[PDB]
Design a protein around this ligand. Structure first.
Ligand SMILES: [Ca+2]
Ligand SMILES: [Ca+2]
Ligand SMILES: [Ca+2]
Ligand SMILES: [Ca+2]
Ligand SMILES: [Ca+2]
Lengths: 276, 290
């Protein structure tokens, strides 16, 4: 099966205007007529995202602002953190602006110092790097790849799992972070084995979604497992799991077994499987 | 469309990482006396014999796992295997690096080395918290570092990068040559995934930035660890329009062109395409002979 829909935060590619990032003159020129999106510390916004006049906060782009690119018509848009008076629905462009702003400002919050030598870092190039104050070495935004997998039997049954300390009825796909030295396919097999003890084959990619909570990209997969093999939960974070039929899943979707919100690529994978 | 013919090098085998032992300091300390040890120099080179990484006796360097060692998992016999950085005697044996000689390694050795290389390089670059600047201390067999001030765990970093073969749906594909590259050296278009974008959006954005094409039907082919120093390469193909002209926007590409399957096959059997462990070569090969 393929995904029926593009995942929600994946929909558009905004015009990021990469070439402007290293052009402080063009950034400073665009500022007077530029738009500004403002996020609080949890990455929440005012709502379509409110775009205010950048010029209101100053006559030049502040250090801690991030240049998001251009909206249709060529207006520059920036993002800043501020005290205000959760993506966790928006138009496509707002969703992309927010995903970018959220990820980038969360990175800044967590990248104030060099991991290499501990020196403070200074934002630069429209907020797309931070520079080691001592050495001049550039640090770059971090996005951790994570897999999320629907294990199925090749027919009408699929594994869903509930993490320890998730609410009782809340089941979903199996997830994990990619480790150093492994392929995505190897990561999927490893993580499924760790979580529910199954050996899976035919690991197949479905799609992807930015997941700035705070810094993931979710990579969706399906894989073939064997229901005659028993579960085993000890090595993982799963409290329980079971094989469910397409009928059960469709039923749970139409609502009791609870599946994650359409925001997650997880829901899109399950939906696309259940109605294939 | 098309699929990869081969699993990329470095993707072939998945190590027994024995994750549960990382958080069991007692079992790690017990296993040490009979444990194996792989040693990498600063450039990530090792000694190999018959395609297989040399495993020395861990006990020779000390009675306990040193702080800077990384626990790689289990080798045959129940034995633990670890990696450390060390100065290697460049004159008393050939030192092979994965990037130049990866083809010579057994699958398991290649994966051990890829993991060790990535993990030791991470340690070298993760001595301090990016959050607050505090020193960090390795723990869990080298699989985290702990903020000395706050106790917050820092985790190994792997940056996703895409690499894309843009084609016309038929018999022609874009290859591009970077400014810093020798004449006739062409390859696929590559870039790092940025915050806030999907892989598909990243592919479209990077192709646009590098050669000015608008591409659709972004399709995943495969993946390969790429510890030089800390990537994972994610291979894709996409449909471009040859009637749209190139534009070398971001300044990274000096030239690019559409090449036929015949040209590419020809260049592979020797536009220069050298031999390579990169997924890039596997993508081009798989396309050219589809
Ligand atoms: Ca551009
Ligand atoms: Ca585990
Ligand atoms: Ca051998
Ligand atoms: Ca020496
Ligand atoms: Ca690039």
């Amino acid at each position: 099966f393929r995904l029926r829909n593009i995942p929600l935060l994946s929909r558009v590619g905004l015009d990021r205007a990469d070439e402007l990032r290293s052009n402080p003159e063009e950034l400073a020129k665009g500022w007077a007529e530029a738009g500004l999106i403002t996020l609080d510390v949890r990455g929440r916004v005012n709502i379509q995202v409110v775009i205010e006049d950048a010029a209101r906060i100053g006559d030049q782009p502040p250090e801690h602002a991030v240049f998001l690119g251009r909206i249709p018509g060529g207006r520059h848009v920036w993002a800043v953190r501020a005290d205000l008076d959760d993506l966790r629905l928006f138009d496509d462009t707002s969703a992309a602006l927010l995903a970018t702003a959220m990820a980038m400002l969360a990175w800044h919050d967590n990248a104030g110092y060099s991991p290499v030598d501990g020196s403070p870092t200074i934002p630069a190039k429209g907020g797309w790097v931070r520079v080691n104050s001592a050495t001049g070495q550039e640090e770059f935004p971090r996005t951790d790849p994570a897999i999320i997998c629907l294990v199925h039997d090749g027919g009408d049954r699929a594994v869903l799992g509930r993490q320890k300390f998730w609410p009782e009825r809340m089941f979903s796909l199996l997830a994990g972070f990619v480790e150093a030295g492994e392929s995505l396919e190897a990561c999927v097999a490893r993580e499924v084995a760790e979580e529910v003890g199954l050996t899976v084959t035919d690991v197949q990619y479905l799609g992807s979604q930015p997941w700035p909570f705070p810094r993931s990209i979710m990579l969706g997969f399906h894989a073939i497992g064997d229901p005659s093999q028993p579960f085993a939960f000890n090595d993982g974070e799963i409290a329980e799991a079971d094989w469910f039929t397409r009928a059960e899943v469709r039923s749970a979707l139409e609502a009791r077994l609870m599946l994650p919100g359409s925001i997650s690529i997880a829901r899109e994978i399950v939906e696309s499987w259940a109605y294939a």
